[PDB]
Structure 1
C-alpha cells in the first residue's frame, strides 16, 4: 500500500527559541515572530511560532498535532514545512518565518507596484507546490491566496494543511454538493486563487451569501474576467472551473502554461505602468542540520 513515513519530528526545548513580536491573532491562534538558536551551533534562524489562543482543550491539542504531522512530512521549495514542536502546556508549532506575510495581504497592500512578471511567477510557484502535494498523494482542501506565504517577493510557498488530508467560495462544485475532495478539486481552488491574485485581492462573488453559490455554479456562472487578463490567462482560470473534474487541467500542465507565459509576461497580462515596476542569521532553508 503506502510507503512508510520516516519523517523526523523535531522537539524544541523552550529555551532554544525566543518570541519577539506578535504577527497576528485569530480563530487560528497566536503567531509570533521569533528567533531559534539550535543548541551548540552558532546560528540564529528566523522563525514564526504558533500558539493556540486562550485554551488547553484535548481536542485543540489533537488538531495542532495533526497539523504538525502533515507539515513534518513535506519537503519542497514551494511548500511550508515544520521546523519543530515545543511541548509546552500550550503546544507550539515552529516554522520558518515568512516575512512578507500571506500573498493575499501582500497583493492588496502592494498592488500599485506588482508587475506581470511577479504575478505569473507566483502562479508557477503555486502550481509547483500543488504538484508536489499531488505527488505525495496529498489533497490540500484549503488552497487560497490567504494560505500562500511570502518568503520574499520572488518566492512564495503553500501552507495551511490544517484541513490537509467551510471555505465555500474556493470550493469545487462536487465538494459543495457531495463533500468530495480530490487533486482536481484543488485545481478549482487554484483557479480561484489565481483570480484573487489577478484582481489584486478582491473577494470572489463579493457580497453574495455562501448558500447561493452552489446554485450560481450549477447554471454556468463563474468569476468575471479580471481587467488585466488576456483571454489566454482567463481561459486557464475557466478550465479550472469546469464541471467535469477530469476536464480540468493538471497541476503539471498549469506549471507549463504559466511558465510559458512568464517568458513574455506583457503579452499575457496588461497592467498600466508594468514597465516601471545579525552576524549569524541563517535562513531556515539553508539550515539542514539534524538533531
Structure 2
C-alpha cells in the first residue's frame, strides 16, 4: 500500500493539543474516510529529547489489536513533520461527559468501569503499562464504547503522569508498574461516581502531599459496592491492590460484587446504557 502524503487529505479542525503534538481531523479524498491525524514537529521533538517517546508510541500502537484501543492505520512524514493516522472517535473524551451530565448512575459507572478493566487486562497481558490513564485519554466512539489513547509515555516491560492520578510509589522510589494503572483506575471510578477526582488541592505539591497520606473522603451518595472496590484499589502498598499479580491478577478483580451482573466476554458487542 503506497505511502500517503499530506496532499491525499482534506484537513479540518483541531481535535486536541498537547505539548508535543496536535491532533487534526482529516478526510482521505480517495475514500472519504475520516481519520484523526496526530502531527509532530521533528525539530521540537529533537530539541526536547523526545525521540524515544515518539518511537515508543509508534511501536506500542503497532502491537495493539483490541477494540478498546485507538488504532494506528498509517504513518508518513514530510520535511518538518511526522504524521500518525489514528481512529477518529466521533464522540470525543470521557471527561466531557463527566462535566456535561455531572455524574454517572450506577448502571453507567458499572458498564464503563468494566470496559476499562477489560482494556487494562489486555494491555497488561502484553506487558505494557500506560502510566497516564485518565478521563482525557479515554475516548468514546460513535457507538459510545471506549477507545484508549496516548501511548507515548507507556512502559513496555523515569516519567510521572498527571498529578491527580499519580500513585504514591511514584512520589517515593519514583518507580511504576502494573499496580500504578490500577491506582489510576480507582481514581477514575471515584470520579465517575462523585463527579470529581479524589485528590484535589490548590497546587500540585498539595496534591502530592494528600496522596501519600491517603487523604480523601467519600460522598454519602456513593454506591456501596463501588466504594468497597475503590478502597481495594486506592491502597498505599502497591502489592496489595486488587488486580495485581501479588493479589493473583484480574480473576479476583472481575469477581468483585460491584461487577456482579457483568458479562465480561463480549462487552463491545453489548449496547451501552444511555448517559444521564
Q: Above 0.5 in TM-score?
A: yes
Q: What CA deviation, in whole Å up to 9, does each residue of 1:34-57 have, x standing for no partner?
A: 2236x6xxx443210111369544
Q: Residues 264-279 of structure 1 correspond to what in structure 2 (within 5 A)?
A: 277=276
8 Å CA contact 1:71–1:161 kept in 2: the answer is yes
- Structure 2 residue corresponding to 1:82, chosen from 72, 96, 101: 72
Asked if the contact 1:145–1:196 (Cα under 8 Å) also holds between the matched residues in 2, the reply is: no
Q: Which residue of 2 aligns with 1:232?
A: 225
Tell me, which stretches of 5 or more residues in structure 1 are unaligned? 1-8, 264-273, 278-291
- Once residues 176 and 275 of structure 2 are traced to their aligned partners in structure 1, the CA distance between those partners, rounded to angstroms, is 42
Q: Point out the more displaced range, 79-88 or 173-182.
A: 79-88
Equivalent residue for 2:253? Answer: 254
Task: Tell which deviates more after alignment, 118-127 or 60-69.
Answer: 60-69
Alignment of 1:192-231 (within 5 A): 192-200=187-195, 202-222=196-216, 224-231=217-224
For CA contacts below 8 A with separation 6 or more, give which structure has more relative contact order. Answer: 1
Once the two structures are TM-superposed, the CA of residue 161 in structure 1 deviates from its matched residue by 1.2
How big is the shift at 1:12? 3.2
Q: Find the aligned partners of 2:5 and 2:17 in 1 and give their Cα distance.
A: 23
Aligned residues: 252
Look up the match of 1:64. 54
Could you tell me which of 17, 35, 40 is aligned with 2:9? 17
Distance, in Å, in 1 between the alignment partners of 2:55 and 2:9 is 20
With the length of structure 2 as denominator, give the TM-score of the two structures.
Answer: 0.79
CA-CA distance at 1:86 after TM superposition: 1.9
Under a length normalisation based on structure 1, what TM-score does the superposition of the two structures give? 0.75
Matched residues in 1 for 2:221 and 2:143: separation?
Answer: 20
User: Structure 2: which 5+ residue stretches go unaligned?
Assistant: 244-248, 264-272
Q: CA deviation at 1:61?
A: 5.1
Q: How does 1:28-177 map to 2 (within 5 A)?
A: 28-36=20-28, 43-52=31-40, 56-58=44-46, 59-60=49-50, 62-88=52-78, 89-111=80-102, 114-152=104-142, 154-165=144-155, 166=160, 167-177=162-172
- SS of 1:20 mapped into structure 2: strand
Deviation per CA, 1:162-201: give whole Å up to 9, x if none.
Answer: 211142321221121111111111100111111122223x
